[PDB]
Design a protein around this ligand. Structure first.
Ligand SMILES: [Pr+3]
Ligand SMILES: [Pr+3]
Ligand SMILES: [Pr+3]
Ligand SMILES: [Pr+3]
Lengths: 231, 4, 223
């Protein structure tokens, strides 16, 4: 079955009736592909199981050893959480046509010609491209995902929140930061802590940083440009 | 330079 | 040395009014040893229409390109402006202007990646796609790189049925097809000729839009 070792997630459609998601999901299953309905988080640990305090960046759950390719399907780029997760993990967001093409070639074709842009940057007022370390089809997702050093690899981040309702959206950001190879630490206050930068929601922080301080949008900027936009 |  | 020592630049747009100080940027780059091609990147290749005879072989890099190792087209965003499309064809990075500014801050040529604009918008798929750029191996000159480049339309044999006014826009398409590694042959009529596909202006047989589609998706969208 063509999609034998492939993991899929579907996002959107961003635009009404842009693709038959219900249908496509089937096709992929019908051809041996795995379909993660909640996105790609399954492929990694839950950082919030898990402990708390200083959270270590993501590691691939052993399961991922059983597949070698993953894609997030979308009709176009979005900031929908499956898209952002993909962006974070460096998994290709591809247009649905990719699948159809695969069935026509009766094999998993190169996804490249179907690689959507990464997203729109307000920082630069432009749409950027995705940049995806190629699939070395001798390494499982697990292998690949674990060797992945994120763009925020090493960076130490303090996230000040005062696990419920809004916090869920807060954690989402921590996740992405983690996914981007950064080490997040969640405090109620900064005080005298050492940090590469501080992540408050919206705005705030008194406080003689000194770091400095930035908002979630910064992360999205990093997600899209796959870079530490502070440097 | 054109546009299309 | 000067940061942009071995870099070739072209500027497109701005696509949007006052989106960047092109006049200014061009200067900065020159001021820092960079070469600025005002007409685009065609200089880096032969002119296929010099002796427009038989008929016509895809592009080869003019020996000059041996003297540089990196090229960029600067634009505030993706467009179908001819410098953009040429870049797209030759697989040179279209990058947002910030890339240069960043280079000056790092006092070196940084990785252009974080500044790599999308390739463009596909009507075929109703979406914006990403660029995909064979990395710069900084031991190979543009010449080296550009010559080893086998286009997405490499091998494909194309018949174009049509050098004045409109024809200029026609040839532009032939160029891109060529740039994309395809072998174009220009006839007045098809007749009995052998071909992988036929390129007529407007609207097997297909229209220039098909080429733009190939340019953006960097792929033979017929396959
Ligand atoms: Pr298998
Ligand atoms: Pr397997
Ligand atoms: Pr030099
Ligand atoms: Pr359409």
């Amino acid at each position: 079955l063509i999609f034998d070792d492939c993991v899929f997630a579907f996002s959107g459609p961003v635009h009404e009736d842009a693709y038959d998601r219900s249908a496509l999901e089937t096709v992929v299953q019908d051809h041996g592909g795995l379909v993660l309905d909640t996105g790609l988080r399954p492929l990694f640990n839950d950082p919030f199981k898990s402990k708390q305090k200083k959270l270590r960046h993501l590691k691939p759950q052993k399961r991922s050893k059983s597949w070698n390719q993953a894609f997030v399907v979308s009709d176009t780029f979005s900031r929908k959480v499956k898209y952002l997760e993909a962006l974070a993990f460096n998994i290709p967001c591809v247009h649905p046509q990719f699948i159809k093409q695969c069935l026509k070639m009766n094999r998993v074709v190169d996804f490249s010609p179907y690689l959507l842009a990464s997203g729109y940057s307000h920082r630069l007022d432009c749409t950027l491209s995705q940049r995806i370390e190629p699939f070395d089809t001798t390494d499982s997702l697990y292998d690949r995902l674990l060797a992945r050093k994120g763009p925020l690899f090493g960076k130490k981040i303090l996230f000040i929140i005062p696990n419920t309702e809004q916090g869920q959206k807060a954690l989402a950001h921590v996740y992405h930061a983690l996914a981007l190879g950064a080490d997040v630490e969640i405090r109620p206050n900064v005080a005298h802590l050492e940090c590469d930068l501080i992540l408050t929601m919206d705005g705030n922080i008194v406080d003689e940083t000194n770091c400095p301080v930035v908002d979630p949008e910064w992360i999205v900027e990093c997600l899209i440009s796959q870079s530490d936009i502070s440097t | 330079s054109q546009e299309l």
